[PDB]
């Protein structure tokens, strides 16, 4: 649970994708959305809407009142199943929306924390867990340095000594 | 230097509901409940519907002088209350089964089988054509000629390749006096023959209420004459005989539709007495009485999923 | 420390992946309770027939005692007072369904016994006051003066509502019994209406005695529109109507079979084992319900887990 | 998971803190009650659509239609039973997993507040008084205040 | 120390509401698709099978139809049986009679009134040839006149058996009025069948008809269930097709009439299909809609596989 | 973070140690097998099956009633087909997410066991002080004692 949690607000200035990073550098400050996680989720939610619509089977029915006044018992029998199927479909659809609406919003909570742990596991003691979903580097890190946090190609032992020394300064 | 992780957010107002949380604002949402219709009748798979503007199926099937050609239709539409049913009052035996069989027809063609010249002929003011009284066009009213009513024996044989639908009727006069005036013999019989059908109809002389100024009655019947089968008539003198038949080919079934709307050159997969539906969606809420491949009817107003994440603007 | 609640809870729920689980608090969504007595449906008392069929109460069976509105009808599994004189009713079930819910029902005299003067008819099969009698609401026309003539009478609905007419024909046992009752050998009943056009003929056939009677009497019915007129004409096998019933039909229900008896209450859902007062979505009380009810389910416990698991 | 058995002695709410000092979190508990109460109501109220019902009215020579009425009645009893029984089984697990997430997320709501100012011990975490543990419940806890006090007793 | 999950050389794939085509460790299909292609019993009860006969042809003593099965669960007749009524005609409430006989706990044919007591003379037609030499229905008797008149036949059978008893009888509709006098001297004829429940009187219907099996005349059949202590009374003037045999019946359950071309195999099932029985504990199948017995729910799908193991890469 | 899974692990579904001297966890796997066994069983056993007969018993003059029996056979097919299809897709996601859960719950079962006595590498693996085969049965058991190896970790961490 990260959306309603430590990352309280959603970055209203991010349009590239759904989940992304924000870097504060002396050289610049900007947003860069993680396309790998967003495209997996954009395809993921569309897979759910399509399966709800495509798995439905329709086989042509002609629904009309064809019984006369001396056949009202059969007329009520057709009413029972017409009204019975409206009750089955209305209830199943309404709850299907509610159940899958939750599983969508929680699918976004999990994808955020998994990406938060993707950075947290990547750089371990080379930064400090601030608590906003943000990490402050113990060392210096420029614009090309932050491909690696996004890509996943971040070398911890390169800047480790800079983190081990700038930490004992107390 | 710092790195922050976050999620999308936009100026969105669309709301969805969660089984645990109500009124949740959302980035992007999609609706799956069809609420749209175009308000005009259309075809089904490109096949037109047989539409009767002011006539019932019986009034159009018989030759009602007030009723006004189509070789094929997918379904039938008739108004809530047609004003041109049977001009001369009466009944139609197995009328609902006959309508359901004619709901969807592959081929339909009127055929003359036994003409008027071979059959004298009777008329009533309950069926006006042009000020002057007329009668049903597709059938003949047999009244006595030269004051003596003899026996009629006429057999038509279906020689066409399809099944054909024969219609005929019997007349129930008001009292015993009107019968002798029209049909000389006091006791009357009508026998119809077929490899399937065996019946013998006797008129019912009974005092009744005036309907369109007519206390008499006329009750109609029908069968389907198999391709090489023949139908045989033998009447004492209460006969309302067929002059025209209908070659039919039966390949599909639909229902009879009730709506006041009319035709527009459109096409659709699902039909509704309020207007057609063009939907890939799984549900709708337009009308219960539908014809065609349709979404499931649902008693609701909103079925909105959450395609995007929850938003706080 | 960070922890969660726990109490002395005994209610157990089930999980799609766990067979047997204990839980803090549990809520049931399956209604299993009824009150064991009939009530009103949306504030309308039902029409209850103690030992009477719909045909026995509609006709004038003396065993049944002589209400303008009811939501549904209750009759026992097998009422002991159907037709005191044996016979059959034509379209009896469609008539019952038509009368299952009536907004206005009122018995009216249309053609009194005084107007039928051929004579009346009586049988020992229908005892009323220890003496042989017949149906209260219909009359059996038997020949008078040893000569049966033609009876021609018509009634014209003059009311602002529809009215229901009942009549019938008598099927004698043999050809000799008819001549004694009805001098004409061949006989007809012709009923005329803007809608109805029928002609009844008796069928003489040897039959077994039911309630000490070998003959039969077969009944028919129609609805007379507010300005239409019904016309009877009989050579003399006529069971003629004396009473009719003004009908205002605004909704439909069913006939209910239950041995229960009335309690002064009200309900939205009715059951032959007692009405239900529930807003829950499911029940396992009975399949044969009348009114807005939860859905019938074959289960004993449908309990959700409102609280967290507790051990 | 880690916090085993729960507390029998907690009656404030469902999720709560325990303090052992020299001298419940209603926010997480209130959001949970609102969520589950909404689940029960929606399972009851979204099916609120209901109309009239009837019984059986077919004679002995109409038993084919009576069997057709039996087919649809037994068919709907099969549908509603299977849906309801599975709906209860499915939503009960999602309810139990919903409590698992709330407890661990409440564990991180405190874990993110104090980083090196304490040691992760059973879901239990310098000196801290009764007014100090208001900061743990509210989400308004200060890290740099007791930073050096922990930095020095950590290396002892 | 490393922590990991299982993986095996599995190509089995399942689908997910958000992912499609997941290679998975273990998979289980819950959709039944296999059937044994042969007719089996039902919970230990054999079925009544008619190779080339319909129920009407098997019930009446049709000379071509063959078999005293005292108990059966359901009835099998092929698509278009070739042995219905050897003499053409109709069967009244035929479909309701078939639905009643679909499941019978006890069945036994009983002679109620023999051919000797009806000595009118017996009637035979070429439409029902037993062995080239013409015969009639073996269970009913065609009562044709003797010498100069048709004296009224009065015969009654008071049921004294312990079970309900099914009676069949019929009426012959001649081709023309001349044929009736030849067979039954009286021109106006009747058949009166009386029961505490039944009150019936039949009149033949003279009508010119087409030849079916070389016969233009028809024969309509009727039936009732005579309660244990009840009596049935026959009084006819001619045109009478009289009952010679009846059936004791015990009714304890209902079933349907099945259309299939297969034949019996010594097997037992809880669910039967016109393409072959099913032994499935699965909740779903896709074999055939027309099923008998406790069965899984019919579904239109080819694969319904759950995922039992974790995903594999 | 645990990519590809262990193909050399056949003891069960769910530790791998590279010590100087694969053993699956017996509890976490059997409890997982019990659940998935219960899900498939509850999906099947909750179905209610009754004796029903389908036969197309209506003649040619009863086709309206025949069309009514059609609409309900067609209605129930569309219901069961849509429900059975979506139930599989929903429960298959739950099953695979349930397996992602059991893998992570075991990762934290070992992580909280040895805290500052090891380093989270990032592949679901840790690097310890020294630990033997009888020391890693203590990690599997849940009977891993922190105060025994605390000083050795605090000393080799300042290197
Ligand atoms: C159908 O056949 C049965 C069998 O005979 C007939 O039932 C019987 O009817 C007779 C006379 O109606 C009954 O006679 C009597 O027994 C009572 C004592 O139980 C006695 O008080 C009388 O004096 C007389 O002896 C006989 O009991 C009765 N049998 C049964 C089993 O009820 C029946 O009448 C026949 N049906 C018709 C309508 O012909
Ligand atoms: C039933 O009674 C009504 C009442 O008299 C009759 O209606 C009248 O019909 C005549 C001629 O059709 C009209 O001139 C009157 O105005 C009608 N009266 C009303 C109040 O509408 C009716 O004819 C009777 N029905 C029959 C068939 O006898
Ligand atoms: C209807 O007309 C057809 C065509 O004449 C008749 O069918 C033929 O009957 C004759 C004599 O029975 C045969 O020689 C022909 O071979 C038949 N033709 C076919 C295609 O079978 C038929 O008999 C007439 N039907 C009736 C009832 O009279
Ligand atoms: C899932 O993937 C499979 C293959 O990856 C797709 O199916 C193949 O479909 C073709 C065409 O029918 C068959 O010839 C192959 O036998 C199938 N292979 C397998 C293993 O299924 C399938 O279409 C994919 N599903 C979706 C929805 O994309
Ligand atoms: C949800 O919002 C709609 C309009 O926004 C409103 O009608 C409704 O009352 C709201 N529900 C609640 C519980 O606030
Ligand atoms: C669940 O446990 C109770 C007692 O422990 C027992 O009555 C019941 O049979 C159990 N259910 C199953 C399915 O084992």
UniProtKB/Swiss-Prot annotation, chain A:
Name of the protein described by the UniProt record: Hemagglutinin HA2 chain
Natural source organism: Influenza A virus (strain A/Chicken/Hong Kong/YU22/2002 H5N1 genotype Z)
Signal sequence coordinates: none
Superkingdom, taxonomy of origin: Viruses
Disulfide bond annotation, renumbered to this chain: 141-145
Residue positions with a glycan: 151
């Amino acid at each position: 649970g990260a959306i309603a949690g430590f990352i309280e607000g959603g970055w209203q200035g991010m349009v590239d994708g759904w989940y992304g990073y924000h870097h504060s550098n002396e050289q610049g400050s900007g947003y860069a959305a993680d396309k790998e996680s967003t495209q997996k989720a954009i395809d993921g939610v569309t897979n759910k809407v399509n399966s709800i619509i495509d798995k439905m089977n329709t086989q042509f029915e002609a629904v009309g009142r064809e019984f006369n006044n001396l056949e009202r018992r059969i007329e009520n029998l057709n009413k029972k199943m017409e009204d019975g199927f409206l009750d089955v479909w209305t209830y199943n659809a309404e709850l299907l929306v509610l159940m899958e609406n939750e599983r969508t919003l929680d699918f976004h909570d999990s994808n955020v924390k998994n990406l938060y742990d993707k950075v947290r596991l990547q750089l371990r003691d080379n930064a400090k867990e601030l608590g906003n979903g943000c990490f402050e580097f113990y060392h210096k890190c420029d614009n090309e340095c932050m491909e690696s946090v996004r890509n996943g190609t971040y070398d911890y032992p390169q800047y480790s000594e800079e983190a081990r020394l700038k930490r004992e300064e107390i | 230097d710092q790195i922050c992780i976050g999620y999308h957010a936009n100026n969105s107002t669309e709301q969805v509901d969660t089984i645990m949380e109500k009124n949740v604002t959302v980035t992007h949402a999609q609706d799956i409940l069809e609420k749209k219709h175009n308000g005009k009748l259309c075809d089904l798979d490109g096949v037109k519907p047989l539409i009767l503007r002011d006539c019932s199926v019986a009034g159009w099937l018989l030759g009602n002088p007030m009723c006004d050609n189509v070789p094929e239709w997918s379904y039938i539409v008739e108004k809530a209350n047609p004003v041109n049913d049977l001009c001369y009052p009466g009944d139609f035996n197995d009328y609902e089964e006959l309508k359901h069989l004619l709901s969807r027809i592959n081929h339909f063609e009127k055929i003359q089988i036994i003409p008027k010249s071979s059959w004298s002929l009777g008329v009533s003011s309950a069926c006006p054509y042009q000020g002057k009284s007329s009668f049903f066009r597709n059938v003949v009213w047999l009244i006595k000629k030269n004051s003596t009513a003899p026996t009629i024996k006429r057999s038509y044989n279906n020689t066409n390749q399809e099944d054909l639908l024969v219609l005929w009727g019997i007349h129930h006069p008001n009292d015993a006096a009107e019968q002798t005036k029209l049909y000389q013999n006091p006791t009357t019989y009508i026998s119809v023959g077929t490899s399937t059908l065996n019946q013998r109809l006797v008129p019912r002389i009974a005092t009744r209420s005036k309907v369109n100024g007519q206390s008499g009655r006329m009750e109609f019947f029908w069968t389907i004459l198999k391709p090489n089968d023949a139908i045989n008539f033998e009447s004492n003198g209460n006969f309302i005989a067929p002059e025209y038949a209908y070659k039919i080919v039966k390949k599909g079934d639909s229902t009879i539709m009730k709506s006041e709307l009319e035709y527009g050159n459109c096409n659709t997969k699902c039909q509704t007495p309020m207007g057609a539906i063009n939907s890939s969606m799984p549900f709708h809420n337009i009308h219960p009485l539908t014809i065609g491949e349709c979404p499931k009817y649902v008693k609701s107003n909103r079925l909105v999923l959450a395609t995007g994440l929850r938003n706080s603007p």
